[PDB]
């Protein structure tokens, strides 16, 4: 068949990187494409094509309990060692990890259909909303 | 509420580069990083948590005819103009992109369920499989 429409989930990529490589693709852009998934959406009628397709990578995984301290390797960020104990102030979900850093760790809350991200490091703040969807 | 179960998409993103910077991260990551909006998926069960965070950026829209040539920059990655033509071989999509490299181009077609793409630049070949969603 010569139909493509529709949405494409990549399952498999080889040789990316000799790829970009030729195209003197920069490394660092390198380093973070070849661990993305593709996803491509195709509409197609006759012969007009329209292609758009988005790149995802698997950004940080992690799995805790509440007022349970344990250690974690920041692996997919700065790959450093802390001792991470996350606990309930009122609603407010509080992360405290112990390493390196001072004032390192973050602070999660609800309001309304809106999760609210406050990510600390040192003297810098990270502020992030999310919307339920 | 102490529900953050769910599906959560970004909606805003403050001084993600400084909490960044603050923990060492290289100039480069970062500055991809910044580039993408995020999609948090919390599945919380009690005091246990299990949070999946990913990150996407839009990346390549493309609109083209079949056997109809046209000039395009190859934004999405080298951004180098090139001559861009697309035609049928069969049930093959063969498209060559004519400027500076050599050999530059991709193939795609359908087998059953899955898209298949082969992308082509010196002597370099990438193949890609895409199962349909």
């Not at 698997?58 to 349970?68: E, K, L, P, S």
């Not at 700065?78 to 390493?99: F, I, M, P, S």
């Given at each position: ?56 990578f ?11 301290e ?60 999310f919307?339920?969807?």
């Open positions: 068949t010569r139909d493509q429409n529709g949405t494409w989930e990549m399952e498999s990529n080889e040789n990316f990187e000799g790829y970009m490589k030729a195209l003197d693709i920069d490394f660092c852009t390198r380093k973070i494409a070849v661990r993305c998934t593709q996803t491509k959406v195709i509409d197609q009628d006759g012969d007009n094509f329209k292609d758009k397709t988005t790149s995802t698997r950004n940080y995984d992690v799995d805790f309990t509440v007022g349970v344990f250690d974690e390797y920041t692996k997919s960020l700065d790959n450093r060692h802390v001792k991470a104990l996350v606990t309930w102030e009122g609603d407010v979900l509080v992360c405290v990890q112990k390493g390196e850093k001072e004032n390192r760790g973050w602070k999660k809350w609800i309001e309304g259909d809106k999760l609210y991200l406050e990510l600390t490091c040192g003297d810098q703040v990270c502020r992030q909303v919307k339920k969807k």
